[PDB]
A paper describes a structure:
Here, we conduct a comprehensive functional analysis of the Antibiotic_NAT family of aminoglycoside acetyltransferases. AG resistance is primarily conferred by three classes of aminoglycoside-modifying enzymes (AMEs): phosphotransferases (APHs), nucleotidylyltransferases (ANTs), and acetyltransferases (AACs). AMEs permanently alter the AG substrate, preventing them from binding to their target, the A-site of the 16S rRNA in the bacterial ribosome. The fold typical of the Antibiotic_NAT family is evident in all structures, composed of 13 α-helices and 8 β-strands, and determined structures superpose with pairwise RMSD’s 0.8–1.0 Å between 197 to 266 matching Cα atoms.
The meta-[name] adopts a dimeric structure with a buried surface of ~900 Å2 per subunit. This enzyme also forms a dimer in solution according to the size exclusion chromatography (not shown). Similar sequence signatures (residues Thr165-Glu171 in meta-[name]) were identified in all analyzed members of this family, with His and Glu (His168 and Glu171 in meta-[name]) along with two glycine residues (Gly122 and Gly158 in metaAAC0038), completely conserved. This motif’s threonine (Thr165 in meta-[name]) is also conserved in all but one of the analyzed sequences where it is substituted by a chemically similar serine.
Residue numbers in the entry:
A (entry chain A): 4 to 262
B (entry chain B): 3 to 262
Write the structure that this text describes.
Amino acid sequence: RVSTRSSLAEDLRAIGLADGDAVLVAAALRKVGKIVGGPDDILDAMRDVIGPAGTVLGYADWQLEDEIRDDPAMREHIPAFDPLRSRSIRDNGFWPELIRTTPGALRSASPGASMAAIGGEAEWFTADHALDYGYGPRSPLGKLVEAKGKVLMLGAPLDTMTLLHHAEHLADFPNKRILRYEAPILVDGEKVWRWFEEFDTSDPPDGLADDYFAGIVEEFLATGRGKRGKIGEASSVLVPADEIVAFAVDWLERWGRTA
Amino acid sequence: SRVSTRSSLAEDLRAIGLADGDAVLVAAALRKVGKIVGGPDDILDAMRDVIGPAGTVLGYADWQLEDEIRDDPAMREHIPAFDPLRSRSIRDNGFWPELIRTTPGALRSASPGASMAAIGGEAEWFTADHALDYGYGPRSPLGKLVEAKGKVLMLGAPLDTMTLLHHAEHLADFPNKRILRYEAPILVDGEKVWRWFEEFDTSDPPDGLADDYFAGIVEEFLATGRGKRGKIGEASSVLVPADEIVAFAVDWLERWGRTA
């Protein structure tokens, strides 16, 4: 069947979205199916279910492709990171670009961990995003747990749950990989190369698989605290950010104590 | 097999004919340009560097409607009205018009079928007072482009996608000019109100002509030496004065209707 802004609203209410919720969404918009007014009907329906006080987020990142790090003669030609002009990454899909390009949207300043938010608390999730360790508490992810937010996997593969990288920052497990890279950002309004360091989110900890987030999400849904539903034609899940992070921290700490 | 930079694209745009201050309507196929360092925005950034802050880059936006609005009924109330701020550009000619519209500081026309995204110094002038009915006539950024003696750059896109020539279809005097009538939801007094539109049909060539007959008119105009070709990145491009090819397409169409 075709999905409308009214139809998508009922599908989002059924899966467990309410007024005032702040939900981080990673979406594979192709699985949703035919929509009348395009994929904007999804975002418009969400802002109707959660209201103007609710907030919708999306993992923006940016198109850099690691050709900046050690391809000199590119350095003077790589544009600086601008949280107003830098396009979001196309790895997980068009959904982060849909939020950012929507009028009235905002975008945090940490290049690797940048989130595109829109809604009443969009000014709060994007503000004061730490550059180094951009997945820690001083990030939109940590504020999503602090605000008891939700996460909706709109047909996207479950291993793409970026929120669980915030659990990697908190989990006490031995030998985390410290990733030090150099990226160009805007310092005093001009392009300046800053040295960054964070926990390796491009590769899992030594031992686990690249998609070990998928097993953590499937284990959490087995508890019943999560909800599974369909939005249009895309089978989706909806989990609380505060519980699945604490569930993943215990998952990682339990796995790390085997030393 | 070379890569293009913001500085590299600027020097390529200067050789094709782009200069300071002038306006340029761009229909582009960004894949033909090849690898670019800072993404496709380097193309738009390079133009605004060559044309200066007073120049204006325009793009044919239209909007996503897919003609499912046409007569599919009771799907009528579910169609969001046309918003020159939130309705996205059609994706059939490429990402370029949406690249301009989503760029900060850009504006967008008000005629749904013929809407145009513009950014630059005179972005306010080109997008203003765009007539809903006959959105390709003299009261459109196409007519304002001819008035300001702008240019048209075919950045890898096929020459039959030069939208400016639709403005010449409106000006040319040839018999049996088809008329397209349709209704689409727009914004009247801040609310969605359906409106019947009347315009010269642009989705089909007039009187059994080739669907790509725009490409021939540009190819014949380029034979006069009045335009200029040149590679921008790795894409063969065509820069053409806006006023001269409209006068060329008018005489081409008027003499064609006479010969019939």
